[PDB]
Design a protein around this ligand. Sequence first.
Ligand SMILES: Cc1cc2nc3c(=O)[nH]c(=O)nc-3n(C[C@H](O)[C@H](O)[C@H](O)COP(=O)(O)O)c2cc1C
Ligand SMILES: Cc1cc2nc3c(=O)[nH]c(=O)nc-3n(C[C@H](O)[C@H](O)[C@H](O)COP(=O)(O)O)c2cc1C
Lengths: 147, 147
Amino acid sequence: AKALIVYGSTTGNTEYTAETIARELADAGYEVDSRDAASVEAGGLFEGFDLVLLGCSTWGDDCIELQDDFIPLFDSLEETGAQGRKVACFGCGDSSYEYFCGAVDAIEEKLKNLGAEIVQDGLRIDGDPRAARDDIVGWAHDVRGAI
Amino acid sequence: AKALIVYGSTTGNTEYTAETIARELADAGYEVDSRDAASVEAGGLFEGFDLVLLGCSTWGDDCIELQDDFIPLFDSLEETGAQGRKVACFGCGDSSYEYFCGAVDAIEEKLKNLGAEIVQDGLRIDGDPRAARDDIVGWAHDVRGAI
Ligand SMILES: Cc1cc2nc3c(=O)[nH]c(=O)nc-3n(C[C@H](O)[C@H](O)[C@H](O)COP(=O)(O)O)c2cc1C
Ligand SMILES: Cc1cc2nc3c(=O)[nH]c(=O)nc-3n(C[C@H](O)[C@H](O)[C@H](O)COP(=O)(O)O)c2cc1C
């Protein structure tokens, strides 16, 4: 099975989360393509993957702001190949702000509006993801299991 | 049963939606207190209500922005009495923007983080709510039915 993990990450927490997820999937035998959102183009990005995991941190005080590298992928998600695609989202955030991991809900609602098949409720990490390693690995285990 | 509907609405669509919802509930025998978000204080706002319906439009282009009259209630939802409270959210929005009715998800996730009991998936209206009257009434019917 081939999986694509695409992450927007500014201070490296969602990137560390993606790497942990990539390792859990690769350990399970997936072929994993892990890409920073800054580097991708949306047109056709999900073509050929059996699973796509989108990871994105959240910013802003009074408006939910997605991580900036992710915003163009998000703005063009309708061109990514999501119809019928198995996907799940994850994101790092901080419960001391007003909208906890709001980027995760935003991306999930857009993938649903676009026909994606969300396979596990998103992983919303508060704080340093290095402290939520079991959650992250556990989540990756559940995603795989839900395929 | 007493219900409280609190709405943030700028161009009147979520207000018209609240009024339609209030009428459906009152027709069913609820006592309905319908309040504009601009007028309320958060401290203790849900005390004594059997059902609370929060309505809020969405603004911003690249950041999800809740309707401004609603933002202080949202920022203080932990002081409203939500623990264990039956609630449901609704909001007007427009699918030509990037984050469709993102304020509805935001408020739902916060009411969940705070112990509320969300009783029906939120009503996210695209376009003029006067065109989605059956949906709105239908939704109010379902909320009541889920109590
Ligand atoms: C100005 C600012 C605003 C933020 N806003 C939010 C927010 O609204 N919601 C949230 O969950 N986290 C918010 N955060 C927390 C970051 O999402 C958090 O630091 C996360 O670990 C960043 O992940 P990243 O390194 O992958 O970019 C904010 C941080 C800053 C500095
Ligand atoms: C600058 C601007 C930004 C908007 N952004 C969003 C948005 O991000 N998401 C959305 O669903 N609707 C968005 N809208 C649409 C309004 O939510 C829509 O007009 C709705 O009917 C307003 O409800 P209200 O009259 O209750 O305030 C936006 C409208 C404007 C003018």
